[PDB]
Amino acid sequence: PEIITVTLKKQNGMGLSIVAAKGAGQDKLGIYVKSVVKGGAADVDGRLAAGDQLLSVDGRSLVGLSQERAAELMTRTSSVVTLEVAKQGAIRREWYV
């Protein structure tokens, strides 16, 4: 799983719409990019994309946390935010029914 570090200058927010989900593989709850806002900070930066997992915010992990704990952590971010992101794999575990 490819992991990268993305640093953003917040325009109005990071220009990101997120969701709490469990990876089909995982038992640990995670924060994922549901979609990117065109023309927002993450869009212009050009790295982040729907499906990417947000591992940490400002060095503090987002993995396995309550939706309350994670929301608190997002509201506390500076004008500048550094994310560790697990890039969505080409070869990936998924759940079929």
Added chain:
Amino acid sequence: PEIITVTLKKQNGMGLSIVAAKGAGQDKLGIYVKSVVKGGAADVDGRLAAGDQLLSVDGRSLVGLSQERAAELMTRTSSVVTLEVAKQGAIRREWYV
């Protein structure tokens, strides 16, 4: 929130790729349609779509359950399955960052 009942004749499975997530509004974990397989049972039926929440399977609720409990419930389904689905709203709660 519009709720409907969809009954499917399983071809090879329902032709559905699902995910466990929390609605931005919700604290209850849910089963959602991540994507539909073209040419699968749900596709041909034409009702189900990415974003829809799967409320119950065969009359048994999928809301708020462990990923183990839900997977067990999906593997137990007959050649015929009846789902209660909460259609993804146009006006909906979402989580921006």
